[PDB]
């Protein structure tokens, strides 16, 4: 076959898909010799999801020529729900493919499940969106970010992130009241995973919608830490690092007016 990619367990792919299934509907996967790069855009055109999976994540990966597959995420999730989480998952595609084949194989028995999902015609480019030198770049445990976002979303539908010298401030203003959380950079050698790091060139202040951040925090299940890159006149980048890839959310800030 043109493309054959094997996951030891279907669980990994299911968790990867579940990380951004609630923000976008149509996705485009480009598979090459270096791995799979996928992109999706939400209906409101306010959030962009960019997934990268390297060859190290597959038990066996083979892709002779680059292939582009446009698919609909809800159908993919429905198909994946039909396969067990303890079975090897093989993605198979042919030249100029019209469908993608998902093979669920259980080595314990002779049970093989073949599922063909019909591709959709989607002609689009990834644009390799990544700003060169962001104004500020910080990173902190995903649990802390998720807790802060959940706490602040209860007060307002908008959340403001302000970055100043050795200071990161999350602010929300609503009808019943206001909330503000201030965190300073710190490093602990006993447990470096709980440390938060910051590097700031210019002060930044950006407002975002609470619903989009609530969707984004769902990716905390894929990584223990999250990296936030912020820059004026550019979308904010939220990155969750995988074993051999990454999941990136580019969120456009609200107009200041």
């Amino acid at each position: 076959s043109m493309l054959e990619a094997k996951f030891e367990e279907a669980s990994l792919f299911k968790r990867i898909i579940d990380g951004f299934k609630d923000c976008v509907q149509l996705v485009n996967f480009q598979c090459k010799e270096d791995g799979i790069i996928a992109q999706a855009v939400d209906d409101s055109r306010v959030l962009l999801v960019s997934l990268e999976i390297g060859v190290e994540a597959f038990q066996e990966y083979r892709c002779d020529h680059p292939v582009t597959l446009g698919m609909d995420l809800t159908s993919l999730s429905k198909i994946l729900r039909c396969g067990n989480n303890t079975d090897t998952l093989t993605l198979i595609a042919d030249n100029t493919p019209d469908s993608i084949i998902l093979l669920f194989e259980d080595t314990k028995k002779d049970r093989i499940a073949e599922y063909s999902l019909k591709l959709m015609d989607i002609d689009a480019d990834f644009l390799k969106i990544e700003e060169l030198q962001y104004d500020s770049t910080l990173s902190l445990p995903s649990s802390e970010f998720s807790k802060i976002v959940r706490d602040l979303s209860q007060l307002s539908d908008s959340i403001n992130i302000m970055i100043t010298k050795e200071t990161i401030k999350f602010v929300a203003d609503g009808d019943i009241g206001s909330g503000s959380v201030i965190i300073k950079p710190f490093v602990d050698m006993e447990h470096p995973e709980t440390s938060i790091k910051l590097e700031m060139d210019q002060p930044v202040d950006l407002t975002f919608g609470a619903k989009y951040l609530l969707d984004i925090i769902k990716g905390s299940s894929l990584s223990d830490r999250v990296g936030i890159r912020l820059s004026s006149e550019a979308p904010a980048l939220f990155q969750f690092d995988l074993k051999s890839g990454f999941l990136q959310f580019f969120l456009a800030p609200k107009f200041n007016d």
Partner: protein
Amino acid sequence: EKRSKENLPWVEKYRPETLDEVYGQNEVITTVRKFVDEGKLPHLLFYGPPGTGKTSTIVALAREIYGKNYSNMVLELNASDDRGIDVVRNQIKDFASTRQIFSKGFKLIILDEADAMTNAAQNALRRVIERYTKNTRFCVLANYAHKLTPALLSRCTRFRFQPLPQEAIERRIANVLVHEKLKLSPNAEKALIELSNGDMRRVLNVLQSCKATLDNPDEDEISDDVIYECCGAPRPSDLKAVLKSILEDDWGTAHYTLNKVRSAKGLALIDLIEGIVKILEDYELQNEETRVHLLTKLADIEYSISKGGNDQIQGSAVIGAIKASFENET
């Protein structure tokens, strides 16, 4: 798409890509070009009949403003998508209230076929349009103005797309004949323009069918006969003969002539009625009653035909109506 543009229908293969390829709307094109070139684009309402260049014009304007990546910098919604009150409240508001992703600039929202939207959504759109005017502009395309609420119309600058003038159609036909190696006679062009009724889609479709009809398109010229054969439309001579027989012969002769003319080419009665109405429009009648009776009875016959019915009875009714109406001239 698939394969190449040569596999597309001519109506789609010749879709304008730039504002310089939009013909027959010089005033609107010039005004919009001046607006964009000076950074003073208002909210737009393109109102017009089918196949006049509204969608093409707005797409070309967006491409000019944003370039090739315009598809990722605009929010286009049409009747094929859901545009309820919830959509306006969430998706459109979020798009209008947020900055661009791929590159800096202002937000463009194209509500194509806005006449198919519910009144509640239109009402919800009013404050969305008013509040985010600083960074967002709205363009709405319509064929029926009566379906748009007065509040929405008050907020948009109106541009009317007239039926395509004949010279624009000739220029487009010349471009097509330059691209497709085809030969078209002046009578064929005249008939095509007459039957097009100001619609470019009709021109392109009929030209494609005419080319398909030719045995050797490389060295075969499309004539009026080819157009009438492919379209199955009455020839002017047939209409003139039918009218002359109706107005100058006995009932039996008129019936025979109508039957023979219809059977020779298998023409439909509705096309004959349309042609006869067009011919009689130019007639100078001495009594208003003749015109009144002609119009009323022919409209009744057309409405009856629209629902089916007996064709022979309808033809006899047309003959009798014309005879009775013209008996009033005395």
